[PDB]
Ligand binder design. Structure first.
Ligand SMILES: O=c1ccn([C@@H]2O[C@H](COP(=O)(O)OP(=O)(O)O)[C@@H](O)[C@H]2O)c(=O)[nH]1
Ligand SMILES: O=c1ccn([C@@H]2O[C@H](COP(=O)(O)OP(=O)(O)O)[C@@H](O)[C@H]2O)c(=O)[nH]1
Lengths: 357, 357
């Protein structure tokens, strides 16, 4: 069973720019995983996208707003000549040249188009339920196409009204791109995500000030004032902005961290930064939020802290020495490998393709 | 050649409520025309719709905003669980039970869905180009499906960037519902449309005040203040609001008018109120706007006046006596009859169905 797959990307930004968030990496690694199994993968993505994984056809159009800026919304908004439209018009054109289409966009349109196609479409939902519109579409589409929508974790599937019908497909990273670090040069803390008020970067800064550890912040700045508000609310904290890096430059510096702090105020579906941290030997200290409670093994690969408890973060940092950095790396080698992930996806696609009609 | 046709309605409101404007009538009369030729017609329309023309399947969902409120827009907005979505999901379901789908909604989605269907879809565009989004979609769809999009008049087709590829299909009214009136009891003026600032009801009121003729206003009030602003800017004018009536109650009172005033500030694609006026023997006095210049035969069935010339309206009213009311009725009997219109549409659909693939 060797298949031809069409991977349809997020319309939020171009692959390799970070503006698309963690999906940019799960899309390319699913590509690597499935090709490792001998499948052809074509990536459809907005103009400016870059990748060395496989064939990428770029599509012109207007970029889409991030669903994280429209939380709880009851309306669907598409810009004129949207890349999302254009990618799915392209998909409609070439659909007969592929065995299955794999959608990564967290958007009303691909879900709506699903039954208008005459090819199996699988959906990767990358985030918890952020709106009644996306929640309602997930319900309608899985009822029409059972087993066609997947999520990272069960905690993610729980955020959806009909999560019980979602497939839990785990995650995978390309472990070859991450170097294990046993002893960082200088003890320090890391924070990896988009700099926005609902990421909780305020709690991490405060933990850094309290423990005297330097904070290195990895991510893209969306609110240039919110980045000054943090530095002006915690002026004794040594905070370094590393910008948005490539996976290679990111793992290089991440591995020099004593631990990664994750401070979600919402329900994090899955922590891509958490898995990458583990790959570098960096233990993970996170609030009990969504998939993270399933990632972090409390007292073995990090610590789970009650939501929004800055005091609890500070206490876990002071326990860091009790975590064997190698346990983190080994947990990531056993689960979250492309091999196992690529296998799950393969037997998933293989069932959809076989039963389509 | 006897066909099964699916008529998809406007999502702006329910048929028979007027909120949908003039399309509510052109849809039902196209139904009557094509059935008169021996074709089956099913109407898909939002919940609350009413009709005695044929089978109407109502569809639940959230109503859509009128494109007239979003002029020049560069975005497409769909409410959660929109009737428009739901009508076109229904259409996708039953499409194989029909020979052709006839869309009346002035909306991005039906145009976008056109090639995702496997049945010929014809489009009735009811208005001039009101946005770059609808203009761009009309271009893309007619290039994919030549001869599948139609408009009222050539003046309407000119508003579109690729109007040269649009079909000009005229219009038809059910003449049996309109009684000719040769001499109204009291001389008076009429105005038929939606009460909004771009309809120019201010110029008609002023014409009424100046000529001492009473103004009867037919339409739905959208801005309850704009209806007081007019009555408080022209307080010597005798203005009567007749509300929104049915075709029977409308023709009954319209026929008692010495003339219908039309004061478009935009480019009116076609004047449904104008044709109905003619049916009642009421001459039409209109600015030189869009299709109206083709409707009104200057000095034979009414008068064309330079855009926004209130003085020119006043002068034409004082010439009313020179118009033979019967010429108006006879122009409407010769053109704008269901028979001729139903014939054009039939030979139109018949060509699309035959050449589809
Ligand atoms: O300087 C950088 C370079 C890359 N990434 C990537 O940003 C993604 C974070 O995804 P996650 O699921 O952990 O949460 P998200 O921020 O997407 O909500 C990860 O793939 C990182 O590799 C980052 O955060 N900062
Ligand atoms: O009290 C009423 C009852 C019905 N109509 C109908 O409103 C439509 C006016 O359409 P037109 O194309 O002339 O311009 P529009 O107002 O739709 O832009 C016509 O079908 C009328 O029959 C009206 O205007 N007032």
């Amino acid at each position: 069973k060797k298949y031809r797959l069409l991977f349809l990307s997020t319309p939020v930004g171009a692959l390799g720019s970070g503006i698309g968030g963690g999906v940019e990496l799960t899309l390319q690694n699913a590509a690597k995983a499935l090709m490792a199994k001998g499948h052809e993968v074509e990536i459809v993505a907005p103009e400016g996208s870059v990748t060395n994984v496989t064939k990428l056809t770029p599509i012109a159009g207007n970029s889409q707003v991030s669903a994280q800026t429209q939380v709880g919304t009851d309306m669907v908004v598409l810009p004129q000549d949207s890349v999302l439209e254009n990618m799915w018009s392209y998909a409609r054109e070439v659909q007969d040249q592929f065995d299955l289409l794999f959608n990564f966009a967290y958007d009303w349109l691909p879900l709506y188009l699903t039954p208008f196609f005459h090819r199996p479409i699988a959906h990767w939902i990358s985030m918890s339920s952020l709106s009644p519109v996306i929640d309602a579409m997930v319900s309608k589409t899985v009822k029409l196409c059972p087993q066609a929508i997947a999520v990272n974790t069960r905690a993610c599937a729980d955020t959806f009204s009909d999560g019980d019908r979602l497939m839990i497909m785990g995650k995978g990273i390309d472990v070859t791109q991450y170097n294990f670090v046993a002893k960082p040069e200088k003890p320090s803390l890391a924070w990896v995500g988009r700099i926005s008020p609902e990421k909780g970067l305020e709690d991490a800064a405060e933990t850094a000030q309290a423990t005297g550890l330097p904070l290195r912040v990895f991510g893209l700045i969306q609110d240039q004032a919110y980045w000054q508000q943090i530095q002006n609310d915690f002026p004794k904290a040594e905070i370094h902005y590393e910008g948005f890096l490539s996976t290679h430059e990111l793992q290089q510096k991440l591995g020099q961290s004593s631990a990664l702090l994750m401070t979600p105020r919402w329900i994090e579906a899955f922590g891509n930064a958490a898995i990458e941290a583990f790959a570098c030997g960096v233990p993970v200290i996170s609030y009990r939020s969504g998939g993270l409670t399933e990632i972090v093994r409390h007292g073995k690969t990090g610590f789970l802290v009650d939501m929004g408890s800055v005091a609890g973060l500070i206490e876990a940092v002071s326990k860091l020495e009790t975590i064997d950095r190698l346990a983190c790396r080994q947990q990531l080698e056993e689960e979250y490998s492309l091999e196992v992930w690529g296998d799950r996806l393969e037997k998933w696609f293989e069932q959809l393709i076989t039963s389509y009609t």
